[PDB]
Structure formats: C-alpha cells, structure tokens
Design a protein around this ligand. Structure first.
Ligand code: UD9
Length: 196
C-alpha cells in the first residue's frame, strides 16, 4: 500500500483517496496523526533520528509536492498523482464544512491563526471552527490550549508550526489530545490569512 522512501513511508494515494481515508478517520474513535511529507522533509528525516521514528508511527503520510513524486519514479508502482498538502487541507475542509465537524487551529504568528479562521468561514460556509491560538506558547500555556482543544470537542486539529516541530508536538501530546485527526499543515495559515 505504502512506499519506503529512504526510511519514510509514503502512502500511495491520490487526492481523493487521501480525502476519503481522512473521512473514515473521523469515524474511528482514536487519535490519528496525518503528515504531508515532501522531498525536503525526507532529507530532514536522515539527520533527525527522532523525526524518523515519528514518520513511521503516523496513520497517514500523504506525498506533498511534485518533487517527491519524481523520486518515486524509481519504484515499481510509482506514486499516482501530484498531491499538494495545502490542497489536501482545503479539499478536506470543503467536505466536512456542511456536516459541521469541529475544527481547531493552533499555530502561526500572533493573530495570524485568527485571520485564517475568518477567510475559511467565507470560502466554506457553515464551517465550525471552535477555537484558535498562536504558535508561540509556554509549557504553562500548552496545558491551557490542549484543555481548550479537548473541552471544545474539536475533532480536527490543524497544527501549523512548520517541519518538524508540528509533527513532534503532536506526537508528544498524542496521549493528551482527544481529537480524531491531528494534521501538521505548517505555514498554510500564513497563506490563507493573505499574509503570504
Ligand atoms: C508543508 C510543510 O510541512 N512545510 C514545512 C515548512 O513550513 P514553512 O514554509 O512555514 O517554513 P518555516 O520557516 O518553518 O515556517 C514556520 C511556520 O510555523 C509557524 N511557527 C514556527 C515556529 C513556532 O514556534 N511557532 C509557529 O507558529 C510560523 O508562524 C510559520 O507559519 O518548514 C520546513 C522548513 O522550511 C519545510 O521543509 C516544510 O515543508
């Protein structure tokens, strides 16, 4: 089902299979960790002993970018299509925004996460974004944020802290968090807020 690229499992999925897998994940009552690796993450994975351990315990590693698909041309069944990890995030919010699935946005510089919430509520109307918080907090604050994420009954956590911080922060709190999908989506808040 998956492809071993220099230690990093990449699931052989299309945009639509990846959106379908993620929809079935919301139906299973456990934390799923989704990551979107590109060639640059796989190179990071070689120097970072811990990051590699993490990329092998995620529930879904979705191939981000055209470069990593190119590398797959060495394998027997190469990766089927160009998936952009940002497109995956947006096509995903399109589908759940009618069904009222609660989304929390943790990350980005001060007031950036709040602006991305606004533009999403327009593009995908009726989307339930239950909370946000900037990506610069303390160990004291972390407990407060996680408490909010859990108590507001968020099913989807979009962590925008960049690689590999986002994938590492999720894995540490993989037992504290009570959401169904926690997906590192680094820097896509900056894009949606129009800052970048
Ligand atoms: C799609 C994806 O996985 N992209 C990654 C990329 O993301 P990026 O383009 O955003 O690059 P950064 O320079 O790391 O950006 C930092 C972002 O995280 C926020 N942040 C950071 C630190 C913090 O303590 N709190 C925060 O909130 C900040 O506001 C901003 O949104 O980074 C890697 C290296 O470049 C890439 O290899 C990798 O593909």
């Amino acid at each position: 089902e998956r492809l071993d690229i220099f230690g990093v499992p990449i699931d052989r999925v299309t945009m639509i299979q990846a959106v379908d897998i993620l929809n079935n994940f919301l139906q299973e009552n456990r934390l799923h960790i989704v990551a979107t690796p590109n060639a640059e993450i796989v190179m990071m994975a070689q120097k970072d002993k811990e990051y590699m351990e993490i990329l092998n315990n995620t529930d879904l590693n979705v191939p981000d970018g055209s470069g990593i698909v190119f590398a797959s041309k060495v394998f027997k069944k190469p990766l089927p299509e160009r998936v952009a990890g940002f497109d995956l995030m947006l096509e995903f919010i399109k589908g759940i925004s009618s069904k009222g699935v609660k989304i929390y946005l943790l990350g980005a510089a001060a007031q950036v996460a709040e602006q991305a919430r606004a533009n999403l509520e327009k593009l995908y109307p009726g989307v339930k974004i239950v909370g946000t918080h900037h990506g610069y907090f303390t160990e004291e604050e972390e407990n407060k944020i996680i408490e909010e994420i859990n108590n507001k009954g968020a099913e989807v956590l979009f962590v925008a802290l960049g690689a590999p911080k986002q994938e590492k922060w999720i894995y540490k709190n993989k037992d504290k968090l009570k959401v169904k999908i926690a997906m590192g989506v680094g820097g896509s808040f900056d894009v949606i807020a129009g800052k970048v």
